[PDB]
Amino acid sequence: MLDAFSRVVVNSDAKAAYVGGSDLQALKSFIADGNKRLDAVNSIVSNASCMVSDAVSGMICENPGLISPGGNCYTNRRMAACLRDGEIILRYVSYALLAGDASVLEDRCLNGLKETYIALGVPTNSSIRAVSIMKAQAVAFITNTATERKMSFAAGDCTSLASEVASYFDRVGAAIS
Amino acid sequence: MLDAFSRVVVNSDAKAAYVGGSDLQALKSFIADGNKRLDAVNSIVSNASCMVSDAVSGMICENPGLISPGGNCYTNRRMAACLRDGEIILRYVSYALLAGDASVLEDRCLNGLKETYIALGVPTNSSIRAVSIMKAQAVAFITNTATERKMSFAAGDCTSLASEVASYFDRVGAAIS
Amino acid sequence: MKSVITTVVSAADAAGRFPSNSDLESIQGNIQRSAARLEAAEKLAGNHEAVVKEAGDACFAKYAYLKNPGEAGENQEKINKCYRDVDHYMRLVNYCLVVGGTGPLDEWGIAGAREVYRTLNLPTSAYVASIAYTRDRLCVPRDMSAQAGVEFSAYLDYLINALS
Amino acid sequence: MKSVITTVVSAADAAGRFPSNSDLESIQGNIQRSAARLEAAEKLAGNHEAVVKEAGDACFAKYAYLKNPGEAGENQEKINKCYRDVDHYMRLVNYCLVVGGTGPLDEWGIAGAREVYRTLNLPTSAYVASIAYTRDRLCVPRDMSAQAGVEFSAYLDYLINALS
Amino acid sequence: MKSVITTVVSAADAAGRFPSNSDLESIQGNIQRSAARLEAAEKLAGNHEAVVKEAGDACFAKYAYLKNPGEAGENQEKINKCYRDVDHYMRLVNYCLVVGGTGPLDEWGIAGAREVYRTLNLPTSAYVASIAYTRDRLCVPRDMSAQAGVEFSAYLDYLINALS
Amino acid sequence: MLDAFAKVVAQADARGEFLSNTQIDALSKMVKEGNQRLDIVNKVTSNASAIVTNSARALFAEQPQLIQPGGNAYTSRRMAACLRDMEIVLRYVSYAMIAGDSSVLDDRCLNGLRETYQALGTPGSSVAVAIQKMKDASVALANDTTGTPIGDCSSLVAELAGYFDRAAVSVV
Amino acid sequence: ALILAQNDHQEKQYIKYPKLAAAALMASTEVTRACQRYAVPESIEEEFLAASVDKVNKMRGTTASGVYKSSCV
Amino acid sequence: AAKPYESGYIAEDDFWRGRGIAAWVYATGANKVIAQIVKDFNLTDKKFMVFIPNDGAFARLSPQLRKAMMEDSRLVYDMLAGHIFTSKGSAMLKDLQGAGYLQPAYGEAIGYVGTGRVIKIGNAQVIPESSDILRKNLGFSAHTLDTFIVPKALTKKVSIEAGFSPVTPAKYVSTTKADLRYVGATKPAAVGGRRAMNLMKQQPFWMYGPPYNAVTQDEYEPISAAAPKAFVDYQIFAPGTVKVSPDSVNANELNPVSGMSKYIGKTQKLVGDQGISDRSDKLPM
Numbered sequence A, B: 001m002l003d004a005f006s007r008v009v010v011n012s013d014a015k016a017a018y019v020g021g022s023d024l025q026a027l028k029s030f031i032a033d034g035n036k037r038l039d040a041v042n043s044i045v046s047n048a049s050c051m052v053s054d055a056v057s058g059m060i061c062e063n064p065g066l067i068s069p070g071g072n073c074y075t076n077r078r079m080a081a082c083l084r085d086g087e088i089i090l091r092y093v094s095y096a097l098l099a100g101d102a103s104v105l106e107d108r109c110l111n112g113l114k115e116t117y118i119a120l121g122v123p124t125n126s127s128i129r130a131v132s133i134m135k136a137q138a139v140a141f142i143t144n145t146a147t148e149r150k151m152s153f154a155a156g157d158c159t160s161l162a163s164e165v166a167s168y169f170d171r172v173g174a175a176i177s
Numbered sequence C, D, E: 001m002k003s004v005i006t007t008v009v010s011a012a013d014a015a016g017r018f019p020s021n022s023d024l025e026s027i028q029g030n031i032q033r034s035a036a037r038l039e040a041a042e043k044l045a046g047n048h049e050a051v052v053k054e055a056g057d058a059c060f061a062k063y064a065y066l067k068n069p070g071e072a073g074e075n076q077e078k079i080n081k082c083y084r085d086v087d088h089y090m091r092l093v094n095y096c097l098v099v100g101g102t103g104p105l106d107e108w109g110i111a112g113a114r115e116v117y118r119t120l121n122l123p124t125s126a127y128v129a130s131i132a133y134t135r136d137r138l139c140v141p142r143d144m145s146a147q148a149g150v151e152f153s154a155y156l157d158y159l160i161n162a163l164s
Numbered sequence F: 001m002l003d004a005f006a007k008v009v010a011q012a013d014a015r016g017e018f019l020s021n022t023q024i025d026a027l028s029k030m031v032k033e034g035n036q037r038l039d040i041v042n043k044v045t046s047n048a049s050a051i052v053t054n055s056a057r058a059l060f061a062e063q064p065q066l067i068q069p070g071g072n073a074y075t076s077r078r079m080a081a082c083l084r085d086m087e088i089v090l091r092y093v094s095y096a097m098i099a100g101d102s103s104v105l106d107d108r109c110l111n112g113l114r115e116t117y118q119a120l121g122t123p124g125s126s127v128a129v130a131i132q133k134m135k136d137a138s139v140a141l142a143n144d145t146t147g148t149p150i151g152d153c154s155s156l157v158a159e160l161a162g163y164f165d166r167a168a169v170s171v172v
Numbered sequence G: 001a002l003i004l005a006q007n008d009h010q011e012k013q014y015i016k017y018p019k020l021a022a023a024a025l026m027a028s029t030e031v032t033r034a035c036q037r038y039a040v041p042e043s044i045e046e047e048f049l050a051a052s053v054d055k056v057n058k059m060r061g062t063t064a065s066g067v068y069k070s071s072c073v
Numbered sequence H: 001a002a003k004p005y006e007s008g009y010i011a012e013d014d015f016w017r018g019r020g021i022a023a024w025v026y027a028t029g030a031n032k033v034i035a036q037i038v039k040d041f042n043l044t045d046k047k048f049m050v051f052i053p054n055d056g057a058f059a060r061l062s063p064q065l066r067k068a069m070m071e072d073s074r075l076v077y078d079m080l081a082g083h084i085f086t087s088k089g090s091a092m093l094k095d096l097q098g099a100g101y102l103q104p105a106y107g108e109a110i111g112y113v114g115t116g117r118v119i120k121i122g123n124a125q126v127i128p129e130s131s132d133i134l135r136k137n138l139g140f141s142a143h144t145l146d147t148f149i150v151p152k153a154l155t156k157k158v159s160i161e162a163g164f165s166p167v168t169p170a171k172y173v174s175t176t177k178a179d180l181r182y183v184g185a186t187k188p189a190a191v192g193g194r195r196a197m198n199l200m201k202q203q204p205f206w207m208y209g210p211p212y213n214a215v216t217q218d219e220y221e222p223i224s225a226a227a228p229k230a231f232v233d234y235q236i237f238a239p240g241t242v243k244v245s246p247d248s249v250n251a252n253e254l255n256p257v258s259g260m261s262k263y264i265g266k267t268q269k270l271v272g273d274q275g276i277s278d279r280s281d282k283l284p285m
């Protein structure tokens, strides 16, 4: 898998290039905001267990057919496994935010998911809503606008990280559509 | 006369506050970047004779009416005093660079320098240009961009020290104006 | 302030010269010594309300006569001004470890103090007994390190020798 | 791609955990150490042709049998490939100074490198005779800073220990 | 005799105060910076006979008109006093390294020099031009260590600004 | 008075020079901020009464001797003149924010303010506490979103904080 | 298979082709003899300790209710 | 301009590519300019001398000088023409002794001084460690400088007061917990409620007592004026269901020899906490 530094050395290797003083100008800016990136991964894993049950339970209360007899979240065996994979999904996104590169979200998790949810029978139009609610939460925790828990950071701005995590939660929306 | 550490002490004494926590980190940074400051003050006082003569000569070459009868730098008594008016101004700027605060430059030099130069009749436009030439010489020796000398240093960046000493020279032009 | 920077600048200003090679050699001593004396200044700035109040009643544990009529610890205002005046002195020692010299203690605490503590009849051996208690309370590995306690106590008995 | 990041997110994936405080602390060291290798990287990326030619003719100066017939460097077109490979390794060492680990050197330079040079009769000690020339050639404040000289010449003798 | 010790003892005497903690800190910088200049002075000691010979030829090369009849370098006897007068300046900077400041230059070499040279009709630019040569043939990792060259250059420019 | 565009022109007329190509590219960045500067001046002006009054309310909680008989804000004429001065300083700090240059701030408010408070006996260490309380009420009002698009304004709030520190050192 | 791959190519070979990632696990235990069928326990407690873990390994040869799966047969 | 190792290192723009002195020549397009300077002044036949500044001398160009070269192409023509000298032919470094002059390819006379191994070309200085190489093909001689030769006639309109003076912008170091508190004090007190007193701060402990009498933030709240006529009887309850804990059981911990006590009297407001409170928990009512 790759991170933000192994991504610029697979693009320069394609042209048999060295990395200049101008290819480095984004990497010295990557480690300049490096403290702000750790300070935003830690804002998500600290609310991680609450974020999932926040999200799967919203998926049920919008579409109550998921819990009807013969539904997908019917038994306790099946509802427990939906809360597992809503937590596997959020686990891999924070790997991508920590590395700054979707190479681990899109190869260890998403490589094979769309045909797998076809084989089991997971509805897709509801499992977009699970990842869509977790996208609304994770930009509120990063931008510190969650309505029921603030955290304590140094003052500044994290709109760049708030959209990179929005850019990662919809690859998941695209790789099962 | 205050140094860098005693500037945050007279700021804490105004509100009965101890110095610790948030303010000690900006002073621990002063110690960590402190080898650069001695290595940059040495670069200016090693060339302090050629800097002053080239600044008063370059002030004269652009404005050659100063050495006419009626010009301020006419005779030998006036030229030797103008060569010494600038040798003191460079001396107090190198004190403020060593201290890290502009209080020794404002207390002992700039407070009263304006009404010094209106009693003698010194042209303030010509004296600002002589300071401006010294500013370009001080940034060139700090950043090693001097076209006539190549000083030895360790490798690194000292842009914050050059932008610091440039702000001391602009206080000279704002005072006597 | 009397410091390391302001000493070598004033010495080279009265002589009328540029910062020499021996004036830069003194600021290097300010670098190698700053690690110890900023540890003491941070340990003091976090726990100052407990250090001041522990030393404020070490005055009255030695001198119980100050609650007698006419003395300096009669009423509630006079002990509020007494715990203040000890907290003033501990703030100035925090300022002296930061600057690096006896600057803030000289100009703000010591100069003029003999003429005030005699006019207002405050016993100067009781502005000392609180300072001398803090100097012997310090455990050299427990609160700070070895050289941080050398710097902390050396500014603590400069104040004692200036009141005596 | 053996990085600092890819290690702590692979161990955190074998066990099914989130990122934790040991993982974020590891990426903190990818900020202090990063400056001393990102300027060894640009120092090699600017002056790479002069060190590929200085090391390229150091293979042949020690082993002058290499330009005999039947050997590996008998004609100019084999010499043009030999000077190409020394350029191929310095481009990989420049990559490891950017990603922080030994990612690109292992994935692209050493993986499978041992059985090809045996098959194509390439004497592999001539490869390490140029990298060991590049190692002992560096001057300590002239070329780069002293922390870049230990970071650039750490990836060299990792490659020297790999090839021999 | 300006040193680091002499500057703080004279400043403690000017205010009538004891050696404070701001004064012992300046002696600490004399301890750290000592190993830099004390081996530059060891380098200047055993190799002064060739440094002044190299610097002596570097002023008659620039000013070849000194060997004219009627100038300061007519015969061998006036030539011998110039290699002598540049060996004195190399001894006085050997003193400034072991003292720690610009003391021995300010007393015996600089004070009184610009009226001796004006009266005796000696051009100060040629006493300059041999000092600026040994500043220029000094490259920092060969002739001495990296920090000894900073001190050795710091006194030669102090001598140059005094004559000029 | 003269703003930040007129500041570099006056520095260039006194040298008799055309502006450089580098200097035009540095004035394009000052127009590129443009709308973010006008958001700070909008937020500070729109809450101007509440910034002055609630930071006077917090000054008299920490220094309650100013409103005791014999204090410097005890009477109606002496209290109303104190709120009037705190609104004067907030006015000329917003004037200096829209201009990018602290020239109207000192030529029309600050020059002669220390001389005025020394002839009247007004405590200058208490005026600077009221200035520093309007500062952090306004630099906390600057970097909240509240109907602004999301972005980085941390370079323009360091400029607004520097105008409050300038007004505070010209009276202390 | 992701936590024994030496290469980044070998990682991609296991993600895309699932019948290779299966037999890459199985072939490693045959040559580096870490199967049950090659392990002789060196003590009587180890023969209890090995028996304690495969009672759980045989416990996934049955369903959630205790009826037999098709796997262990 | 392709493979430096190709055709060995005997080509003319592959020899200097593989000598590590000046890789700035082929990095920009200064290689193409000095091959057209040598054509315009007919130097292909006569032996001459070049002075090439090394890598490191390109890096110590000034920021205001480098922008003069990025926008006037005649200035970089005249500067590079001043490094080629046709005076004494293919000279070595032993013929630069003494003080004299040299004539460039285009520019005016440029004076030199040479004293032993220290040779200055005027504004620059020859690095003698590498510097006595001569070429027989295209015949000329090369020496290495440490600074660009740049005459004073060409820098008469570079300046540091045009936009090249260095600046570093100051920052503000606030926190999220501090700015979420102070923004409630910008609403009016008819709207903000208890949040109108959110600008006040924590003072030292002695500031709350008898000469100074500073008000805490709890006293602006309605919890400080709670005095109901009703009361709990405490004999209604079963025995065992009323609990009482002290703060200490020690007499000089509850009240010292001085009157400074946290527990007994009027001196329990002299404490380093409790000047400020949390009225941002509930609402603006």
Ligand SMILES: *CC[C@H]1/C(=C/c2[nH]c(/C=C3N=C(/C=C4\NC(=O)C(CC)=C4C)C(C)=C\3CCC(=O)O)c(CCC(=O)O)c2C)NC(=O)[C@@H]1C
Residues within 6 Å of the ligand: F066, F072, F073, F077, F078, F079, F081, F082, F083, F085, F086, F088, F108, F109, F110, F113, F116, F120, F122, F123, F126, F127, F130
């Ligand atoms: C809370 C404020 C502090 C304070 C203020 C205070 N100021 C005054 C009186 C004057 N202030 C000025 C200054 C200006 N007037 C202007 O029009 C301008 C705009 C260019 C400025 C800068 C002047 C001229 C006066 C005197 C005239 C008057 O307004 O009555 C006073 C009244 C003093 C008196 O004796 O009446 C106060 C109380 N004082 C404090 O205690 C606060 C710390």
Ligand SMILES: *[C@@H](C)[C@H]1/C(=C/C2=NC(=C\c3[nH]c(C[C@H]4NC(=O)C(C=C)=C4C)c(C)c3CCC(=O)O)/C(CCC(=O)O)=C2C)NC(=O)[C@@H]1C
Residues within 6 Å of the ligand: A032, A033, A034, A035, A036, A038, A039, A040, A042, A142, A143, A144, A153, A154, A155, A156, A157, A158, A161, D024, D025, D026, D028, H176
């Ligand atoms: C955007 C997500 C937030 C915000 C983020 C900022 N954080 C800033 C600084 C910061 N964060 C941390 C903790 C972090 N660093 C680590 O090394 C580890 C663990 C290993 C963690 C969790 C630190 C140490 C810092 C540095 C400041 C300090 O000294 O405490 C920061 C300042 C910019 C910068 O430091 O580069 C910002 C803007 N702030 C916000 O307001 C949003 C909500």
Ligand SMILES: *[C@@H](C)[C@H]1/C(=C/C2=NC(=C\c3[nH]c(C[C@H]4NC(=O)C(C=C)=C4C)c(C)c3CCC(=O)O)/C(CCC(=O)O)=C2C)NC(=O)[C@@H]1C
Residues within 6 Å of the ligand: B047, B050, B051, B054, B055, B057, B058, B059, B060, B061, B062, B132, B133, B136, B137, B140, B141, B145, B146, B147, B148, B149, H062, H158, H159, H160, H161
């Ligand atoms: C002293 C000899 C130093 C040295 C000083 C530097 N001077 C620098 C720039 C500069 N010099 C002059 C004066 C010169 N120009 C003229 O037109 C005339 C005559 C009328 C003279 C004497 C001017 C005007 C300037 C420019 C000032 C500005 O930018 O406004 C300078 C900067 C760069 C450099 O030259 O490397 C330095 C360091 N230079 C030396 O080599 C010795 C050590």
Ligand SMILES: *[C@@H](C)[C@H]1/C(=C/C2=NC(=C\c3[nH]c(C[C@H]4NC(=O)C(C=C)=C4C)c(C)c3CCC(=O)O)/C(CCC(=O)O)=C2C)NC(=O)[C@@H]1C
Residues within 6 Å of the ligand: C059, C066, C071, C072, C073, C078, C079, C081, C082, C083, C085, C086, C088, C089, C108, C109, C116, C120, C122, C123, C126, C127, C130
């Ligand atoms: C407790 C240790 C003493 C005691 C002390 C009192 N000290 C009193 C007043 C006082 N203290 C100072 C010096 C102090 N003020 C400063 O600004 C600074 C440095 C920044 C320092 C060290 C001064 C100038 C004053 C007089 C002004 C004032 O009222 O605060 C004091 C008040 C005297 C009085 O009430 O008349 C007391 C009672 N009392 C004791 O019982 C032991 C001796």
Ligand SMILES: *[C@@H](C)[C@H]1/C(=C/C2=NC(=C\c3[nH]c(C[C@H]4NC(=O)C(C=C)=C4C)c(C)c3CCC(=O)O)/C(CCC(=O)O)=C2C)NC(=O)[C@@H]1C
Residues within 6 Å of the ligand: E043, E044, E047, E050, E051, E054, E134, E136, E137, E138, E139, E140, E142, E143, E144, H117, H128, H129
């Ligand atoms: C640094 C600029 C160059 C470099 C120069 C060379 N110097 C050479 C010989 C040499 N240099 C000196 C003066 C210098 N060395 C000292 O020990 C002292 C004083 C303590 C000084 C000022 C002397 C006395 C000598 C002769 C003794 C010797 O070192 O062999 C030299 C050899 C050729 C020559 O000049 O005869 C060179 C090349 N060397 C470098 O590597 C950098 C680039």
Ligand SMILES: *[C@H](C)[C@H]1/C(=C/C2=NC(=C\c3[nH]c(C[C@H]4NC(=O)C(C=C)=C4C)c(C)c3CCC(=O)O)/C(CCC(=O)O)=C2C)NC(=O)[C@@H]1C
Residues within 6 Å of the ligand: A056, A066, A072, A073, A077, A078, A079, A081, A082, A083, A085, A086, A088, A089, A108, A109, A113, A116, A120, A122, A123, A126, A127, A130
């Ligand atoms: C929950 C929000 C969904 C939903 C999920 C269900 N998943 C079921 C089985 C299942 N889920 C996964 C996903 C997951 N496991 C992984 O290892 C990875 C990637 C590394 C992912 C994304 C897998 C592989 C499986 C099958 C294997 C197993 O269950 O262990 C499941 C049970 C189906 C059943 O029992 O018949 C459910 C209900 N269903 C929903 O309705 C929402 C949208």
Ligand SMILES: *[C@H](C)[C@H]1/C(=C/C2=NC(=C\c3[nH]c(C[C@H]4NC(=O)C(C=C)=C4C)c(C)c3CCC(=O)O)/C(CCC(=O)O)=C2C)NC(=O)[C@@H]1C
Residues within 6 Å of the ligand: C043, C044, C045, C047, C050, C051, C054, C134, C137, C138, C139, C140, C142, C143
């Ligand atoms: C070293 C001599 C002994 C030792 C002594 C104890 N000290 C105890 C408490 C204590 N000590 C101090 C002073 C010190 N700590 C600071 O933070 C500062 C200055 C910033 C100084 C000078 C304080 C303030 C306190 C009270 C707070 C606390 O530590 O609980 C102590 C506990 C009993 C007591 O309350 O005094 C002891 C036994 N401790 C040791 O282990 C070595 C042998």
Ligand SMILES: *[C@H](C)[C@H]1/C(=C/C2=NC(=C\c3[nH]c(C[C@H]4NC(=O)C(C=C)=C4C)c(C)c3CCC(=O)O)/C(CCC(=O)O)=C2C)NC(=O)[C@@H]1C
Residues within 6 Å of the ligand: D059, D066, D072, D073, D078, D079, D081, D082, D083, D085, D086, D088, D089, D108, D109, D116, D120, D122, D123, D126, D127
């Ligand atoms: C020069 C110091 C050597 C030498 C080298 C020769 N190498 C030959 C072929 C060759 N080399 C490699 C490894 C190289 N290619 C890469 O892509 C990378 C890294 C990304 C490296 C290190 C390969 C794969 C090959 C075969 C393909 C090819 O020819 O490019 C070679 C020709 C051998 C032949 O024709 O059979 C030579 C002569 N030879 C020497 O004498 C010294 C030891």
Ligand SMILES: *[C@H](C)[C@H]1/C(=C/C2=NC(=C\c3[nH]c(C[C@H]4NC(=O)C(C=C)=C4C)c(C)c3CCC(=O)O)/C(CCC(=O)O)=C2C)NC(=O)[C@@H]1C
Residues within 6 Å of the ligand: F034, F035, F036, F038, F039, F040, F042, F142, F143, F144, F145, F148, F149, F150, F151, F152, F153, F156
């Ligand atoms: C910084 C302290 C703020 C912040 C500011 C931003 N505002 C942005 C755009 C914008 N602002 C306005 C309002 C302004 N322009 C006017 O003409 C007037 C009144 C006459 C006002 C008050 C407008 C109209 C625009 C639109 C222009 C545009 O979209 O470019 C803006 C740009 C968004 C971006 O590029 O990301 C920023 C950053 N935003 C913040 O988050 C802090 C709190």
Ligand SMILES: *[C@H](C)[C@H]1/C(=C/C2=NC(=C\c3[nH]c(C[C@H]4NC(=O)C(C=C)=C4C)c(C)c3CCC(=O)O)/C(CCC(=O)O)=C2C)NC(=O)[C@@H]1C
Residues within 6 Å of the ligand: H221, H222, H223, H224
């Ligand atoms: C008693 C039967 C309850 C109980 C009550 C507590 N209330 C506390 C504070 C509080 N109560 C109110 C509501 C009150 N104020 C009004 O204006 C009106 C109606 C117009 C009502 C009913 C408010 C607004 C507040 C907060 C304001 C303040 O604190 O002054 C309180 C103090 C809690 C604390 O601060 O720790 C208590 C204990 N608590 C109980 O256990 C029973 C159920």
Ligand SMILES: C=CC1=C(C)[C@@H](Cc2[nH]c(/C=C3N=C(/C=C4\NC(=O)[C@H](C)[C@H]4CC)C(C)=C\3CCC(=O)O)c(CCC(=O)O)c2C)NC1=O
Residues within 6 Å of the ligand: A047, A050, A051, A053, A054, A055, A057, A058, A061, A062, A133, A136, A137, A140, A141, A145, A146, A147, A148, A149
């Ligand atoms: C019918 C059932 C039903 C739900 C369960 C929720 C589910 C839900 N939560 C959020 C939105 C959110 N959900 C959370 C999650 C949490 N908030 C916290 O403070 C905790 C850490 C964690 C609860 C455990 C967060 C942080 C947001 C963003 C806004 C905020 O709360 O500050 C959203 C999007 C916007 C919104 O409506 O709020 C939805 C649909 N909504 C519903 O209609």
Ligand SMILES: C=CC1=C(C)[C@@H](Cc2[nH]c(/C=C3N=C(/C=C4\NC(=O)[C@H](C)[C@H]4CC)C(C)=C\3CCC(=O)O)c(CCC(=O)O)c2C)NC1=O
Residues within 6 Å of the ligand: B032, B033, B034, B035, B036, B038, B039, B040, B142, B143, B144, B153, B154, B155, B156, B157, B158, B159, B161, C028, E033, E147, E150
């Ligand atoms: C001990 C007392 C003392 C001196 C004798 C002088 C000499 C000196 N300069 C530097 C060291 C340095 N000096 C500079 C300064 C510069 N480098 C540049 O590239 C710019 C041209 C210039 C001004 C920005 C830099 C960047 C360092 C590296 C160390 C650091 O960044 O702090 C060091 C530290 C190197 C080391 O640790 O050994 C010393 C001792 N300064 C001192 O403090």
Ligand SMILES: C=CC1=C(C)[C@@H](Cc2[nH]c(/C=C3N=C(/C=C4\NC(=O)[C@H](C)[C@H]4CC)C(C)=C\3CCC(=O)O)c(CCC(=O)O)c2C)NC1=O
Residues within 6 Å of the ligand: E059, E066, E071, E072, E073, E078, E079, E081, E082, E083, E085, E086, E088, E089, E108, E109, E116, E120, E122, E123, E126, E127, E130
């Ligand atoms: C201990 C400290 C100490 C010094 C620093 C020197 C300083 C010094 N030099 C000279 C003296 C001199 N300096 C020179 C020098 C020169 N003439 C030339 O041709 C060149 C211009 C230049 C070569 C460097 C000459 C020739 C004399 C002798 C003057 C004379 O003979 O008239 C004299 C006069 C006494 C004498 O030596 O005759 C003194 C005091 N002497 C000291 O005792």
Ligand SMILES: C=CC1=C(C)[C@@H](Cc2[nH]c(/C=C3N=C(/C=C4\NC(=O)[C@H](C)[C@H]4CC)C(C)=C\3CCC(=O)O)c(CCC(=O)O)c2C)NC1=O
Residues within 6 Å of the ligand: D043, D044, D047, D048, D050, D051, D054, D137, D138, D139, D140, D142, D143, E141, H019, H020, H021, H022, H129, H130
């Ligand atoms: C990646 C980093 C990197 C480098 C270090 C240099 C490597 C390097 N050094 C020299 C050139 C040199 N290098 C040295 C330095 C030394 N000689 C010694 O014996 C000592 C160990 C050391 C002194 C500290 C010297 C003295 C020369 C000049 C002599 C020569 O050219 O061999 C040259 C040829 C000319 C030149 O380019 O300067 C090159 C390519 N290039 C690079 O790209």
